[PDB]
Symmetry: C5
Amino acid sequence: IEVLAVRTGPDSITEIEAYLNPRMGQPQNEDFYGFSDNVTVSDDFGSDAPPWKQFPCYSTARISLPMLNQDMTSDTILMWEAISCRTEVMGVNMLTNVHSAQKRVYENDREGTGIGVEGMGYHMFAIGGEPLELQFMVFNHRATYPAEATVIKNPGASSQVFDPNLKGTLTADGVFPVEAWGPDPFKNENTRYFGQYTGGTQTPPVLTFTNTQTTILLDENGVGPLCKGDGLFLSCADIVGFFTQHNKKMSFRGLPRYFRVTLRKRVVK
Amino acid sequence: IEVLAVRTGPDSITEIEAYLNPRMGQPQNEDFYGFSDNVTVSDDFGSDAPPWKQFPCYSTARISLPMLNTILMWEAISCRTEVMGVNMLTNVHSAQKRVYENDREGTGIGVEGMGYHMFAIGGEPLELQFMVFNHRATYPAEATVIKNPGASSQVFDPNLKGTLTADGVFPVEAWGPDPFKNENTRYFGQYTGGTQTPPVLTFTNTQTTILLDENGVGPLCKGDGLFLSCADIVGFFTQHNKKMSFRGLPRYFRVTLRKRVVK
Amino acid sequence: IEVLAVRTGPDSITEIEAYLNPRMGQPQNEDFYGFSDNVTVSDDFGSDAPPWKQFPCYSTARISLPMLNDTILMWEAISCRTEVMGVNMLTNVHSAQKRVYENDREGTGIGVEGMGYHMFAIGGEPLELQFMVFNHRATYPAEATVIKNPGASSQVFDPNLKGTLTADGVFPVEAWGPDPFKNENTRYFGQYTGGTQTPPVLTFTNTQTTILLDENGVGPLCKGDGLFLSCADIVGFFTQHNKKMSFRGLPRYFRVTLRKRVVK
Amino acid sequence: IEVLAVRTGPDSITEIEAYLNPRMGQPQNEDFYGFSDNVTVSDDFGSDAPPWKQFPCYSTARISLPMLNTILMWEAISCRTEVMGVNMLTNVHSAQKRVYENDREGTGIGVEGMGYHMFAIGGEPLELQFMVFNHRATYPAEATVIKNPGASSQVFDPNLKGTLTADGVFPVEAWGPDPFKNENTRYFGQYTGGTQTPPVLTFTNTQTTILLDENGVGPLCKGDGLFLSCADIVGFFTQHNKKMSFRGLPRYFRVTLRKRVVK
Amino acid sequence: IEVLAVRTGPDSITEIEAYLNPRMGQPQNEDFYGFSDNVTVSDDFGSDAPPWKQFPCYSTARISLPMLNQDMTSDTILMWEAISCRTEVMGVNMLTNVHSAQKRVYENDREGTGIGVEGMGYHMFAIGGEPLELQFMVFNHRATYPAEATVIKNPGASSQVFDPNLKGTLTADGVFPVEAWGPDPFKNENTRYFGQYTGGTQTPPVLTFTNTQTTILLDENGVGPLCKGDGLFLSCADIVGFFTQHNKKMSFRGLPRYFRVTLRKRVVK
Ligand SMILES: CC(=O)N[C@H]1[C@@H](O[C@H]2[C@@H](O)[C@@H](CO)O[C@@H](O[C@H]3[C@@H](O)[C@@H](CO)O[C@H](O[C@@H]4[C@H](O)[C@@H](O)[C@H](O)O[C@@H]4CO)[C@@H]3O)[C@@H]2NC(C)=O)O[C@H](CO)[C@H](O)[C@@H]1O
Ligand SMILES: CC(=O)N[C@H]1[C@@H](O[C@H]2[C@@H](O)[C@@H](CO)O[C@@H](O[C@H]3[C@@H](O)[C@@H](CO)O[C@H](O[C@@H]4[C@H](O)[C@@H](O)[C@H](O)O[C@@H]4CO)[C@@H]3O)[C@@H]2NC(C)=O)O[C@H](CO)[C@H](O)[C@@H]1O
Ligand SMILES: CC(=O)N[C@H]1[C@@H](O[C@H]2[C@@H](O)[C@@H](CO)O[C@@H](O[C@H]3[C@@H](O)[C@@H](CO)O[C@H](O[C@@H]4[C@H](O)[C@@H](O)[C@H](O)O[C@@H]4CO)[C@@H]3O)[C@@H]2NC(C)=O)O[C@H](CO)[C@H](O)[C@@H]1O
Ligand SMILES: CC(=O)N[C@H]1[C@@H](O[C@H]2[C@@H](O)[C@@H](CO)O[C@@H](O[C@H]3[C@@H](O)[C@@H](CO)O[C@H](O[C@@H]4[C@H](O)[C@@H](O)[C@H](O)O[C@@H]4CO)[C@@H]3O)[C@@H]2NC(C)=O)O[C@H](CO)[C@H](O)[C@@H]1O
Ligand SMILES: CC(=O)N[C@H]1[C@@H](O[C@H]2[C@@H](O)[C@@H](CO)O[C@@H](O[C@H]3[C@@H](O)[C@@H](CO)O[C@H](O[C@@H]4[C@H](O)[C@@H](O)[C@H](O)O[C@@H]4CO)[C@@H]3O)[C@@H]2NC(C)=O)O[C@H](CO)[C@H](O)[C@@H]1O
Ligand SMILES: CC(=O)N[C@@H]1[C@@H](O)[C@H](O[C@@H]2O[C@H](CO[C@]3(C(=O)O)C[C@H](O)[C@@H](NC(C)=O)[C@H]([C@H](O)[C@H](O)CO)O3)[C@H](O)[C@H](O)[C@H]2O)[C@@H](CO)O[C@H]1O
Ligand SMILES: CC(=O)N[C@@H]1[C@@H](O)[C@H](O[C@@H]2O[C@H](CO[C@]3(C(=O)O)C[C@H](O)[C@@H](NC(C)=O)[C@H]([C@H](O)[C@H](O)CO)O3)[C@H](O)[C@H](O)[C@H]2O)[C@@H](CO)O[C@H]1O
Ligand SMILES: CC(=O)N[C@H]1[C@H]([C@H](O)[C@H](O)CO)O[C@@](O)(C(=O)O)C[C@@H]1O
């Protein structure tokens, strides 16, 4: 796309608000919505098969944007340009719950609070004018992913590091395993992505929330994501950490993410 | 509201100071004020019923500003906020499980574990999203919750809304600020989890937060009311017998307001 | 004070330096100076009497400034440098410390660990205090300055429970903190890091300046030509071989720059 | 080089992207690619021989830039660099020691312990200082080291120099960037130690590092070659039987260069 | 010193590079160079004698500076003024070693990596125009330091906090105990010092290195350290943590520090 002037005038700025609910593995609108199922662990890389529901997948949506009021006789067209966003992890408040079927601090004395949600935090969101471009990369290439999940079958040993042949695009919600796909830095010219990972299984989650924080989406040339087909593409994963039962079974807990995106009209050839 | 120019003049600027005491669960002005009761844990999400006093609720107050009456409204432009009583956490003598419990020796372990620190300043009640760890939790009569909220309440459900209209009855673990509303409120929150996490608190009288949005407009005080909200969970208090309670701290608010003309 | 203009001139700016030694509980010029005594723990809030020497108290000093005079002159504190001193001593892991591998009588001492409480205040009058305690039923010793029978509301904010920091080494840290409702003529700064096995984190440099001017460009104004310095610097806990634990504190350095201010 | 004006014109600016795969010890395109072999520990410094495959080495590449030829040289002005595959660390199912290994229950403990993250961009190979924890370590024949380095190699010895001239054979534990040289390279590194430390990793396509020195001169690419180097140790992978291995991640580089006139 | 104008001109700016090796206690150019000897612990403050080699001392050097080419007939004097520095802890790379004679993560199973270096980090450097001025302060005043060490003997109970009588100057390398001396904030008008302490015995060391970071040494008056007798005084201590043997004996491990200092000519009266 050849990028020209910002289009100013009334109705040249618009704002969308959207949510993505987490896809930690357990089915929608059933009792464990927001959790994975209890995590089983293989004995060997050669006999490793994570059952469906026991691992998180990326959340993704395309938002239909307002009509642009195109200049019919112009050589150029208008595109919605994402210039900034606010994003918040919602429901951070629920993590003050230390009474709901949790392994207790002093379990052998049957006493104390629940241990609450602890362990790894993976927080990533992406905002783009097209689907997020992905690099396939896995901890163990011999893992057999279930048929429900979108992966590269038989990826080979090279997939445990960078292999330029192992590409994909985030085209579906709740099926691309977080542990098998990451943003592709060789692409995503038309998307901004941000991730943080904090590991461990006893690590305290650290989360902030405010309605006062803006992130600029303009690149070094002052150009934000340009919305192809008048679609805004939102992607995230928000693993907060693990829920531990009394019997020590552990499951991923996730939280939904809020997006507010400010878009302006851009002239393109 | 269509917002016009800041109305300058004598007594155009005012300033309020307020405190909000914590609502950690134990009754006001009795021996465990500032604490929850000892936390009990359910064996299943199906049979989860947190008794009244065992969980914290949000604090809220409405501050009467000077009557004013295009109309004039009070606009919140800046604020200072402090957690008060951080000094008390230097107490490691008061009935605390000891570092070397089996040698009956050492200091108390003091207050540790999760920190949840949030405040809000607005010209109307804080707009809330209902969201729970376990939708099947049965909250007590004293608590304001959405009864039988359903499985979608464990993540974001756009039907599950409320507003912070009463002090010390909205469970922290059941309500958070709604980012889809609150256009006339600024809110700020941090959570640090765990049960043995070291608390970290700063205090100074030197730090100001600006409450103006991108357009230079602060919260506009509907009915000449300034709405203040917070929760300040510092961590857990552990008894010798390993019973654990929430401990909270009061919050100081200084808010500077100016006269603003609105349509 | 109605504050008028900065009085500029040859003798218009002065600098003071002072130290406050910590008040962790053990008596001055004796073998445990800088420490508390070994901490004892009550069984319940109803029978809770922290003995003298077993808890730290605030340090405070009034520095006499050069005597100055419709209007009068007052020293205005415009900036300060403050440092925790003797951070170097915490590299000591040989001095009668519980060992890392106590069961094997092997490894270093565990050193100082646990809670950090670092606070200082610079003002033109005594620091204004809010009384607030973990447990209102605690019986404080005769040596300590507290509000006796403070009531259940002293566990949170009670607007009646006020004091001013008017004596060194007797206001328990665990019973008093800065009053944000007052202190218009004082600047205070504090950080608490809790826990009993937390690593202490301390920095020191001679290159950091804190500006003491308020939003209106006025610093603390020294009433009666007095500059009021306050701090508490709890570094953490010293653990003996027999698992007895004491507070360890460090002294704090102040450099304060003051200018002459005309007031009505 | 004496440095003169920046050359300007249609093709005065070029951008390269490159990846360096990690060199953690296990052979490429085999089943443990990205890991070290299981780490064995010596009994004393005098009998200390870390087997090949059990320790990480530095990754390195020379990128061929467009040929140019007062001479013209490519000047590296800025870069973006990202650790790739951070996503893979959400795997807590693959042959890992479990959180409650005695109960055969809970997630894997995942990757934890030491982080070593460093990268360098230069117009010649990275200049290295040899420095080892134990000078008596006997490195294997596959490794490039200073043999019999002396007790002084446990600290700084100005005799113990090298250059990173080969990928996957300079051990991280024996070579670091030489601050007495690398006038024509920019390096950056972070070490977080321990064996149960939680890894902390961030990734974004939005961060630029400026490579210009105080004089406004970037790395000047000798022989029209751009030299990339890194090491990205994320932590340790722990088996059920408690055998531990280094896990590494590949690094992405984007470097912007401009034509620069020199003597 | 009456400080006057900066002297500009062709040779008015110079850069020096230097290293200070650590003085952790074990002898130079022997097998444990860079370590302390294994730390013994007293039972009581009254019977406390840290043996020579079991505790780190401060590193210090006077760097001889290039000739100034003085104005022979001028009433004024040129002095080198230290305006900025880069400083780097070197050898951070070596701490990736978890194989050399280290207590293992799973010592009972004789399995896992070494625990590596962990515990306290003490990192201070000072750049001055004269020797660093010290304040004597000890954890325990009744400690008897070895004859090899420079201390104030029988310093009294006041030496456990601030005593204005208990001063010294860092006049020798490898003999001033870190645990007995720190920078005197009441002096050092002609030196800049910087210190960080992170305590504990199992704390993870955190160290960064770059050739891109510069520290300005100018005071509030735009004046850097002025190098008296044309000497630049460099000091540091860089305790990284402890090394733990299989038999649980523990030693300090230190690292060398790199200094690059930029100096300009300053006219003084
Ligand atoms: C992640 C995974 O699937 N692991 C399962 C695997 O473990 C083996 C692997 O981690 C390989 C990777 O190289 O290492 C094996 O351990 C061996 C090697 O490190 C070896 C040196 O290369 O050293 C030890 O073996 C020596 C000797 O060298 C061998 O030739 C000999 O057969 O055995 C010797 C034993 O002292 C070391 O043990 C891993 N093996 C074990 C055991 O951990 O497969 C095992 C089943 O064997 C488990 O299923 C793991 O989950
Ligand atoms: C949070 C809560 O209230 N938990 C209580 C509940 O625990 C069960 C839930 O955590 C569900 C969530 O899906 O999982 C149960 O564990 C099961 C499942 O993960 C299952 C796969 O979906 O895999 C295991 O069960 C298999 C098999 O599928 C079962 O049909 C069979 O009966 O047992 C197999 C065991 O190998 C896994 O156990 C949780 N159940 C238990 C048990 O943890 O219910 C229990 C009592 O049942 C407790 O009250 C929990 O607190
Ligand atoms: C800080 C302090 O001084 N603690 C001492 C105190 O502990 C008691 C207090 O913490 C109060 C605060 O509300 O709670 C008591 O625990 C009770 C309550 O939480 C109660 C619900 O309010 O639930 C339990 O008690 C029930 C029942 O109500 C009792 O009547 C019955 O005898 O026990 C039931 C057990 O299921 C809960 O235990 C604290 N009590 C104990 C015990 O910890 O007083 C105790 C001695 O009683 C110690 O001196 C503490 O140090
Ligand atoms: C890193 C390594 O290779 N360690 C192996 C080595 O450990 C010895 C080294 O750590 C040296 C370093 O100085 O110290 C030995 O421990 C000694 C010394 O600290 C010594 C004072 O210099 O004090 C103790 O020894 C005294 C006495 O001096 C000895 O002559 C007498 O035999 O023992 C006395 C008992 O207190 C102290 O133990 C380290 N020795 C031991 C043992 O840990 O050598 C050992 C086996 O000898 C292992 O191979 C280590 O891995
Ligand atoms: C750092 C050091 O050298 N410690 C060694 C020392 O420990 C003693 C000191 O820590 C002093 C400091 O004031 O306290 C002793 O513990 C006592 C005191 O805290 C006392 C109140 O002041 O309370 C306890 O003692 C009570 C009673 O008050 C005493 O009068 C009576 O003799 O003992 C009572 C026992 O309950 C508390 O124990 C420290 N003593 C001990 C023991 O820790 O000396 C000891 C040997 O005495 C060791 O050498 C320490 O390393
Ligand atoms: C991947 C595979 O084929 N593994 C084989 C084992 O399944 C098998 O042992 C049987 O395991 C049964 C339970 O199987 C799963 C499960 O659903 O729990 C299958 C999952 O794929 C597996 N998880 C992963 C991440 O690979 C999971 C896990 O290994 C364990 O639950 C431990 O947490 O096992 C059932 O319990 C049978 O009783 C048991 O025989 C063995 C048979 O030798 O072969 C394995 O290769
Ligand atoms: C300082 C003093 O006077 N200590 C006396 C002890 O030395 C003495 O017990 C004897 O100790 C012998 C070993 O002495 C050292 C050592 O290991 O070299 C001497 C060190 O000065 C001391 N360290 C410190 C920091 O004070 C060190 C330490 O206490 C222990 O090693 C434990 O780590 O001891 C040897 O073991 C003899 O067998 C032993 O008798 C006792 C005698 O009762 O009095 C102490 O006052
Ligand atoms: C969250 C929850 O469901 N708590 C319930 C507890 C716990 O199940 C157990 O005490 C475990 O501590 O049991 C009660 O009898 C009680 O203590 O009075 C009723 C309470 O409703």
